[PDB]
């Protein structure tokens, strides 16, 4: 491992990646997903049902069937099984990450159903309510002072808001019929759909923080942006890479390309821009750096 990393590091130092390179790199990824439509490799038939088609915030952003997060917790006669969400495999097993879109008004209740069903503790919001004029996500959380917001049978209040330098940790209390849970919502603002931060540093603090609350894959961690692809992708790719590092199992053939390619067969369009692709690269190269430290 110590030698795997310093090799990785010395090559990166030895050959800088250019913008034209990263654009060539990212085009390959766009090509593969386009070859998945052509070939019908991963049908999106459930999402395409007329009963489901308006539950999708973006019409070309349709979850694959085989990896879709299915709902079965019933709270009314109108409760159905569809949400725009995919499981993404972690280092050790399936269902490490739930990648979903920002809820619409008609899917706020779906959202909470999903959270509750899968015993999610952690919610990562890589998104703002408004972005370039447009509504990007509806309010499913509660703030301090507001008491309990009501989503169907779910009652959502907020104990504490920790305002950190670049995101907020909201401690949510979610009552469902008789039982109460705590969910940590990590809310990262000033990062639009796609643009990118700087530095890479807040994003690594955020993932560092998240992993303090849940170090394992016992339950899915929920990651969402507006679409559930872009900013979402960035976070899953970075978190997954950091797990490989921290447990000292980064392979010799390690590739940011390959990881992202693999994630993209599970939730469509994960990491949506070459700039976001670069961000995951630079973030990963910073993590390797910090892992050499942990060795020394």
């Amino acid at each position: 491992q110590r030698e795997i990393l310093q090799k990785f590091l010395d090559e990166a130092q030895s050959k800088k990646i250019t913008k034209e390179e990263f654009a060539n790199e990212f085009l390959k990824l766009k090509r593969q997903s386009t070859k998945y439509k052509a070939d019908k490799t991963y049908p999106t038939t459930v999402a395409e049902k007329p009963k489901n088609i308006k539950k999708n915030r973006y019409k070309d952003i349709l979850p694959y069937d085989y990896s879709r997060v299915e709902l079965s917790l019933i709270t009314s006669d109108e409760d159905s099984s569809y949400i725009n969400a995919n499981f993404i495999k972690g280092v050790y097993g399936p269902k490490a990450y739930i990648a979903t879109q920002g809820p619409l008004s008609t899917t706020l209740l779906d959202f909470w159903r999903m959270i509750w069903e899968y015993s999610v503790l952690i919610i990562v919001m890589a998104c703002m309510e408004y972005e370039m004029g447009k509504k990007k996500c509806e309010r499913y959380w509660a703030e301090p002072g507001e008491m309990q917001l009501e989503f169907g049978p779910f009652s959502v209040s907020c104990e504490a808001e920790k305002r950190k330098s670049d995101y907020i940790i909201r401690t949510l209390k979610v009552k469902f019929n008789s039982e109460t849970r705590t969910i940590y919502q990590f809310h990262y603002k000033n990062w639009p759909a796609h643009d990118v931060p700087s530095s890479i540093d807040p994003i690594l603090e955020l993932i560092w923080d998240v992993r303090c609350y849940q170090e394992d894959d016992s339950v899915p961690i929920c990651i969402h942006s507006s679409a559930g692809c872009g900013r979402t992708g960035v976070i899953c790719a970075i978190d997954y890479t950091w797990m490989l590092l921290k447990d000292g199992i980064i392979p010799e053939n390690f590739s940011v390309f390959s990881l992202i390619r693999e994630m993209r067969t599970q939730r469509p369009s994960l990491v949506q821009t070459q700039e976001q692709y670069e961000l995951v690269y630079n973030a990963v190269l910073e993590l390797f750096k910090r892992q050499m430290d942990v060795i020394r």
Binding site: Y58, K59, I61, A193
Partner: peptide
């Protein structure tokens, strides 16, 4: 009708 893509 409503897209994403994207970028």
């Amino acid at each position: 009708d409503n897209e994403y893509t994207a970028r």
